[PDB]
Structure 1
């Protein structure tokens, strides 16, 4: 059964992101045609992680998100074994070679601190840096250290608010926000 949200996602995100999002869902036995809100959230999270990684100097970040699960852990293990940093308990999204820390990036439709605290409680990994963005232009990061310069974060906030408007224009925002 063909949903508006699924067709919206496919024309709003670039094909590489859509392909990666489908691969991720099928790895965990999920159907982008059924769980269309999860599909949208995964594409959004992917785009933000890639935009974030573009904000650094050239060699600053290792990109973990978007890799196959087994390769993602291999690279995490290479980082931990060569830096001595503690192995995170859950797959993070980037590794910051300049600040020598993993980064967990989150995108939320609620107040930023609610999602921050949730992920900051599922930590165990006390040394992983958390950076949360909302669809209202707010952000919240560990120790108030926002990693990137302001322009790079502002680009992300702008894109997220654009995604919000495009959904609201299609009457898809209420079911997305409430999912």
Structure 2
């Protein structure tokens, strides 16, 4: 069985805007994508989940992820000052104008409950809502409030399953799955 290149997979299967944003994220944080290829794929995946989440209800969410860090904080600060929402310690992924809170989206190859608990421990912010997706279709969310309806979330999970499946088809999944953290 031939083993493909992860960089090849990423460029072939993600939208080039997502790829470009992922590249900029890596360069901004001092990482070489040509070595950290699995991480590159993870960043693309996470970005795409954030975009899909926002697109599940247009005009409802402000996107924070994918912006350069300074701009991301500028947007967070502006939202806080405008809405009175409390300022988070760490950069979140979205702001929910409807439920009036920031959202952290996690995408993991690990056990969802543990991943959730780790994120919730690190945020140190009872404000930011946490929503975790795994590639296995499992999910976990703050207060068992999943924000979006089953169909939107099904769309996200299906995309994740498709990614995992294409990766396994190229022999990329075994390494990707265990390179996390």
TM range (shorter): over 0.9
TM-superposed deviation, 1:18: 0.3
**Separation (CA, whole Å) in 2 of partners of 1:86 and 1:50:** 23
Q: Deviations over 1:93-138 (max 9, x none)?
A: 0000000000000001112111100100001111100000000111
TM-superposed deviation, 1:57: 3.6
Q: CA RMSD in A?
A: 1.1
Higher relative contact order (CA 8 A, sep 6+): 2
**Separation (CA, whole Å) in 2 of partners of 1:171 and 1:138:** 23
For residues 75-86 of structure 1, the aligned pairs below 5 Å read 75-86=75-86
**Separation (CA, whole Å) in 2 of partners of 1:104 and 1:121:** 13
TM-superposed deviation, 1:38: 0.5
**Separation (CA, whole Å) in 1 of partners of 2:58 and 2:119:** 28
Matched position secondary structure for 2:123: coil
TM-superposed deviation, 1:76: 0.2
Ranges in structure 2 where 5+ consecutive residues have no aligned partner? none
Residue 43 (1) aligns with residue 80 (2): no
Ranges in structure 1 where 5+ consecutive residues have no aligned partner? none
Residue 157 (1) aligns with residue 157 (2): yes
**Separation (CA, whole Å) in 2 of partners of 1:47 and 1:59:** 18
**Separation (CA, whole Å) in 1 of partners of 2:9 and 2:123:** 33
TM-superposed deviation, 1:143: 0.5
Residue 113 and residue 50 in structure 1: after superposition, are their counterparts in 2 closer, same or farther (change >3 A)? same
Q: Deviations over 1:54-77 (max 9, x none)?
A: 0x4432000101111111100100
TM-superposed deviation, 1:86: 1.3
TM-superposed deviation, 1:26: 0.2
For normalisation by structure 1, the TM-score amounts to 0.96
Q: Deviations over 1:5-42 (max 9, x none)?
A: 11111101010000000000000111111100110000
- Deviation above 4 Å: which 4+ runs of structure 1? none
**What is the total number of aligned residue pairs between the two structures?**
176
**Separation (CA, whole Å) in 1 of partners of 2:58 and 2:44:** 24
